[PDB]
Every structure is written in C-alpha cells, then in structure tokens.
Amino acid sequence: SQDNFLLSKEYENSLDVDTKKASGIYYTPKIIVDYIVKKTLKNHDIIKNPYPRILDISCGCGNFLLEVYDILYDLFEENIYELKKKYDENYWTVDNIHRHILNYCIYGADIDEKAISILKDSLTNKKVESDIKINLFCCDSLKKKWRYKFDYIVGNPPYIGHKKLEKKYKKFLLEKYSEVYKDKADLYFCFYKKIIDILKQGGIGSVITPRYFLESLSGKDLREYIKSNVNVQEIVDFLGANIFKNIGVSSCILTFDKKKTKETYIDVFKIKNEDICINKFETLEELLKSSKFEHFNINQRLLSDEWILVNKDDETFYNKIQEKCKYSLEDIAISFQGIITGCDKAFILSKDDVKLNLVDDKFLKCWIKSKNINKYIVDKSEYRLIYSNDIDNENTNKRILDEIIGLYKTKLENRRECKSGIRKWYELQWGREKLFFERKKIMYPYKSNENRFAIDYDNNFSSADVYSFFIKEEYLDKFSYEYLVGILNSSVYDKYFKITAKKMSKNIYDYYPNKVMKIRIFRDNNYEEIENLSKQIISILLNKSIDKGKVEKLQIKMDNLIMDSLGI
DNA sequence: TGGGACTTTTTGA
DNA sequence: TTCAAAAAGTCCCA
Ligand SMILES: Nc1ncnc2c1ncn2[C@@H]1O[C@H](CSCC[C@H](N)C(=O)O)[C@@H](O)[C@H]1O
Numbered sequence: 001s002q003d004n005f006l007l008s009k010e011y012e013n014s015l016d017v018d019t020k021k022a023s024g025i026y027y028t029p030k031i032i033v034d035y036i037v038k039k040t041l042k043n044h045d046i047i048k049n050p051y052p053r054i055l056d057i058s059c060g061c062g063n064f065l066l067e068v069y070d071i072l073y074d075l076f077e078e079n080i081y082e083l084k085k086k087y088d089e090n091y092w093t094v095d096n097i098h099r100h101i102l103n104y105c106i107y108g109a110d111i112d113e114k115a116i117s118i119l120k121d122s123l124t125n126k127k128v129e130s131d132i133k134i135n136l137f138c139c140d141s142l143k144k145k146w147r148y149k150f151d152y153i154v155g156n157p158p159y160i161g162h163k164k165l166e167k168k169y170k171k172f173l174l175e176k177y178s179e180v181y182k183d184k185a186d187l188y189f190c191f192y193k194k195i196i197d198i199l200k201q202g203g204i205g206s207v208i209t210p211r212y213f214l215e216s217l218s219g220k221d222l223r224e225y226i227k228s229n230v231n232v233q234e235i236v237d238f239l240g241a242n243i244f245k246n247i248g249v250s251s252c253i254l255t256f257d258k259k260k261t262k263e264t265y266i267d268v269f270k271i272k273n274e275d276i277c278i279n280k281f282e283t284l285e286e287l288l289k290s291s292k293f294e295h296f297n298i299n300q301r302l303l304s305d306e307w308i309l310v311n312k313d314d315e316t317f318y319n320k321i322q323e324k325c326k327y328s329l330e331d332i333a334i335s336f337q338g339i340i341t342g343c344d345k346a347f348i349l350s351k352d353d354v355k356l357n358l359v360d361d362k363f364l365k366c367w368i369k370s371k372n373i374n375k376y377i378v379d380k381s382e383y384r385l386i387y388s389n390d391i392d393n394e395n396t397n398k399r400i401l402d403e404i405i406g407l408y409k410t411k412l413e414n415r416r417e418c419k420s421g422i423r424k425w426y427e428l429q430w431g432r433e434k435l436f437f438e439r440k441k442i443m444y445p446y447k448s449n450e451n452r453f454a455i456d457y458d459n460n461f462s463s464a465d466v467y468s469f470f471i472k473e474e475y476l477d478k479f480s481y482e483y484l485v486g487i488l489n490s491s492v493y494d495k496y497f498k499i500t501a502k503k504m505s506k507n508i509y510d511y512y513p514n515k516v517m518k519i520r521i522f523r524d525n526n527y528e529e530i531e532n533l534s535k536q537i538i539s540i541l542l543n544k545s546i547d548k549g550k551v552e553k554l555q556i557k558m559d560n561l562i563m564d565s566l567g568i
Numbered sequence: 569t570g571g572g573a574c575t576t577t578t579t580g581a
Numbered sequence: 582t583t584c585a586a587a588a589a590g591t592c593c594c595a
Contacts, residue, residue, distance in 0.1 A: 416578075
C-alpha cells in the first residue's frame with residue numbers, strides 16, 4: 001500500500017521557513033486527516049449518490065485528497081455490484097472505479113504549482129488509454145470564479161496574520177471579503193467564508209483552523225457568519241496542545257453542514273490535558289472518547305456574538321457571577337496600553353548603563369516587563385525609558401541623539417510615522433500620555449498563565465506587554481485598588497476570566513482590555529474583610545525579609561469570602 | 569529537539 | 582491625531 005504522506009513530507013522539507021510563512025505551507029498530520037475524512041465520508045450513501053464532489057481548496061500535495069481517494073475506492077468497490085445493477089451495467093466495473101473518482105469526485109485547488117504537480121502525479125500513480133482529466137486547479141481560491149458547489153469540503157487553509165499579509169492583497173480582502181475580514185483579521189476567515197459559500201445545500205464541511213476565532217475580537221463577524229449560514233455539528237478544541245510539530249499555533253477542528261434540520265445542538269470536545277502526544281495514538285476518535293477529552297453540548301440558537309463553550313457546571317458558575325455583579329471594570333476604570341516606542345533597543349537602557357549619565361533624569365522613566373508583574377505588587381524596575389518626546393531641542397542633548405538613540409536611526413526612520421513626517425526620527429512612535437502612567441494604577445501582563453493584577457506605587461512605564469488601568473474619581477468611594485486586586489487575583493476570578501478568555505498557547509491566555517475590561521465585579525458586606533485581607537497580603541509581600549507562606553492562607557480565606565459572596 | 573520562560577512593533581481604524 | 586489587536590509566536594538548552 002502507498003504512503004500518502006511521504007512525498008508531501010519531502011516537499012515540506014525542501015522548502016525554507018520564509019516561503020512556508022509567506023503562504024502558510026504547513027501540511028496536516030495523518031491522524032487529523034483520517035479523523036476529518038472518515039467523519040465526512042463514513043455515512044455517505046454511495047448507491048444513492050455515486051457522484052459526490054469532494055473539494056480541498058488548499059490541497060497542497062494532497063494530504064487530504066489521497067486519503068479521500070482511498071476511502072472512495074473502498075466505498076465504490078464494496079458496492080460495485082449494487083451500482084452495476086441499479087445503473088449502467090457496463091459503466092460500473094471495478095477496473096473503471098479509478099477513472100470515475102478522478103473524473104467526478106476529487107477536486108483540489110492551490111496556488112503552489114509544484115505541489116499541484118506532485119499531487120497530480122500521486123493521483124495518477126494510484127493505478128498502474130485516454131488520459132484522465134484530473135480536477136486540480138492552480139489558482140487563488142479566494143479569487144477563482146467557482147462554477148459549481150460541492151458535496152464535501154475538507155482541508156486546512158493557510159493562516160496569515162495582519163503583519164505578514166501584503167498591502168494590496170489586504171486591500172482586496174477588505175474590499176471583497178468585508179463580511180468576515182476587517183481590522184486585525186486573518187486570511188483563514190476569508191477561507192471559511194469561501195468554503196461556506198460554495199458548499200452545496202445539504203453538504204458537509206470539516207476543516208482544521210486556529211482556535212483563536214472562537215474567542216477573539218477579530219472573529220466576531222466570522223462567528224456571526226458561521227452561526228447564521230451553517231449548522232455547526234462539532235467543535236474539537238485542542239486548546240494549547242501542539243497538533244502541528246514545531247509550529248506555535250493552537251488548533252481546532254470544526255465540522256458543519258448546510259442540512260435542513262430542526263436540530264440546533266453542537267457537540268463540543270475540549271481537551272483536558274494539553275501535555276499529550278496526539279501522534280502517538282492510533283486514532284483521534286479513540287482519544288476523544290477517552291478521559292483526556294470532555295464532551296458537552298451547546299445550543300447554537302443560544303450563541304451570542306461571544307461563543308461561551310463550557311459545560312453545565314461552568315455555565316452555571318459564569319451565569320451566577322454575571323447575574324450577581326452589577327458593575328464591570330469598564331464602568332469604573334480607565335484602561336490603556338503601554339508605550340510603543342517602535343524600537344526598544346534605542347530607548348530602553350539598563351538602569352546601570354553608563355550611557356544614562358548622558359541623559360538628564362527628567363527624561364528617564366522606570367520601565368518594567370510583563371514578568372516583573374506578580375500578584376498584588378510589581379518587582380523593582382531594572383530598565384529606564386528615555387522619553388525622547390520631551391527632547392524638543394535637537395540642537396542641545398546632541399550627545400543623547402548621537403551616542404544612544406542615533407545608533408538605530410536608520411531603523412527608527414523606517415517607522416510609519418517617521419516616513420509620513422508625523423514623528424521626528426528620535427521620538428517615540430506611540431508615547432501615549434505621561435500623566436496616565438505617573439499615578440497610582442493597576443497593571444497586568446498581556447499574556448499569562450493566571451490572573452496577575454498588581455498595584456503600581458512607583459509610576460512605572462511599560463511596553464504593550466503590560467496593560468494598565470486606574471479607577472475613575474466618581475467610583476473611588478465605592479472601589480479601592482486594594483479590594484480590586486484582592487478579588488481579581490482570587491481563584492474564583494481566575495476561573496471566571498478563563499471561562500471566556502482567549503487561549504493562546506500552552507498555559508498562556510491573552511489578558512487584553514477587550515476582555516479584561518468586561519470582567520464584572522461586586523461589592524457587598526464582605527467588602528471590608530476582603531480589602532483587609534488584600535492589604536495584609538500586600539504588607540507581607542512588600543517586606544524585604546518575609547516568607548510567602550501566610551499569603552497563601554490569607555488568599556484561601558479571601559477565596560472563601562468571595563465564594564460566599566457570589567453564592568457558588 | 570521538544571519543552572519552558574518570555575514577549576515587539578506593525579497595523580487598521 | 583492616536584487608540585489597541587495580533588501568536589502557522591520567538592528563542593534557548595539539556
Ligand atoms: N490564496 C490561496 N488559494 C489557494 N491555496 C492557497 C492560497 N494561499 C495559500 N494556499 C495553499 O494553502 C496550503 C495550506 S497547507 C495545507 C495543505 C493541505 N490541505 C494539508 O492539510 O496538508 C498551502 O499549500 C498553500 O500553497
């Protein structure tokens with residue numbers, strides 16, 4: 001028997017990293033391909049419909065299409081005599097199965113000419129006369145005028161973010177795919193739209209994509225399109241598990257249909273242990289039914305713009321917290337992203353760097369990283385930011401410009417606002433407002449394994465890897481920073497935030513304002529005790545010679561208080 | 569070479 | 582004028 005994943009693996013090894021990233025050339029492993037193909041084609045009635053059109057618009061070398069060929073050959077061979085009796089007796093013979101499949105059943109598209117030729121040769125070599133016409137298109141699937149729809153669509157689209165995509169192509173996507181593609185969206189949104197649009201009535205689509213669109217702000221329109229145009233049959237969420245070897249992406253498998261049905265429920269399989277060697281096991285189907293995965297059902301008609309895919313216990317937990325809390329962080333706080341210098345090496349220096357003797361302390365700010373943020377407090381800053389925006393006189397401070405900032409001048413000149421003349425070559429790209437940072441505030445890392453909200457007492461500045469917020473004046477008498485960090489750092493709120501948080505990679509969640517500011521908060525009779533416990537924790541943490549042991553006990557007591565307050 | 573600590577600036581709006 | 586989102590992440594080693 002043939003190894004359908006050998007020539008494709010060799011072609012993958014031939015390419016380098018840049019050409020892979022520019023076109024998203026990362027082929028799917030055999031276990032996922034087997035699961036998707038057998039999920040779509042296990043129950044096909046080949047006698048009822050012996051002309052199923054099965055498409056992969058990103059076929060590549062044909063990881064999906066060769067397995068599809070094998071499944072189709074078995075299907076036809078098992079019912080050849082029934083097909084012979086029901087239809088033309090001379091057309092339906094075993095020796096004619098091959099020519100039939102390639103003529104009517106397998107369709108592939110890809111921009112990669114060499115991959116198309118390799119797949120064509122692989123399809124031809126499935127059998128050892130007239131040259132059979134193989135339905136392989138070398139084209140941009142997002143520009144191709146498709147002349148007919150398809151019974152089944154399987155595959156893996158390219159993933160290209162908003163930085164790696166060309167300007168003109170992005171303009172085309174915004175003009176023609178505006179239903180799913182805006183702002184910081186991804187190309188696989190457009191591939192989702194194209195797959196849905198050319199799926200026949202009653203057809204089935206099943207693809208593996210990144211999982212980020214399930215929760216991300218950019219995926220809202222795509223989620224609406226999917227919810228309103230297809231019936232989502234199944235969502236397999238791998239969370240931070242590594243499905244693609246040596247690839248830093250988080251994957252989900254999605255199966256949907258356009259069948260006219262009153263059924264509106266979705267099977268959701270969510271992995272429970274992200275430390276799993278998926279390729280070690282024989283099938284994905286056995287893994288889904290094991291204890292490594294949990295299964296629940298979600299009513300698609302009950303999906304809002306946010307898809308909250310949790311089991312009944314977590315849904316009850318989330319609903320209790322939502323109903324009890326009358327305020328959100330957005331209601332009471334002002335949030336902002338950190339400084340974006342545009343070139344950190346030019347403006348960020350070690351606080352022991354000798355070059356800081358050239359810079360007057362009026363221009364120097366304390367600089368912290370995401371790892372400097374712990375629970376309730378921030379580590380002492382190790383770095384200084386040169387707030388070069390306040391260097392108005394270019395004639396003076398020429399030592400600073402020539403010996404520190406100018407060492408990267410060329411790179412500083414390639415920033416967007418310098419090319420347009422908005423910024424001077426030595427200025428910060430996005431210097432924000434100094435007064436927002438130089439005050440008591442709360443800071444949290446932009447990516448973390450857990451809630452880490454700290455009170456900043458030292459007017460620390462930061463890059464965009466740290467987000468900040470401060471309480472509005474009108475809400476200062478109702479909420480204090482100590483109480484806020486007390487409740488936000490609790491295990492209750494850790495779980496509550498992770499209910500809807502954007503899962504990025506293994507043990508990493510996105511902590512961005514678009515979801516952090518939606519966290520709801522409460523105040524009740526337990527306010528004083530929670531605030532007092534938080535202040536005790538802060539006092540213990542700030543002592544130079546101290547042990548963190550009692551902090552855990554205080555945290556347990558505070559978690560008990562919060563659970564009592566929220567009735568969970 | 570797979571697992572863990574850590575996270576820049578480009579970009580549309 | 583100036584906000585904030587975005588992992589086919591990056592990068593190192595035992
Ligand atoms: N605009 C476009 N139209 C069609 N195919 C494209 C495309 N942009 C990228 N591709 C192709 O999409 C493929 C994604 S890699 C996945 C290949 C295959 N489906 C598998 O799972 O193994 C790449 O081979 C790339 O060449």
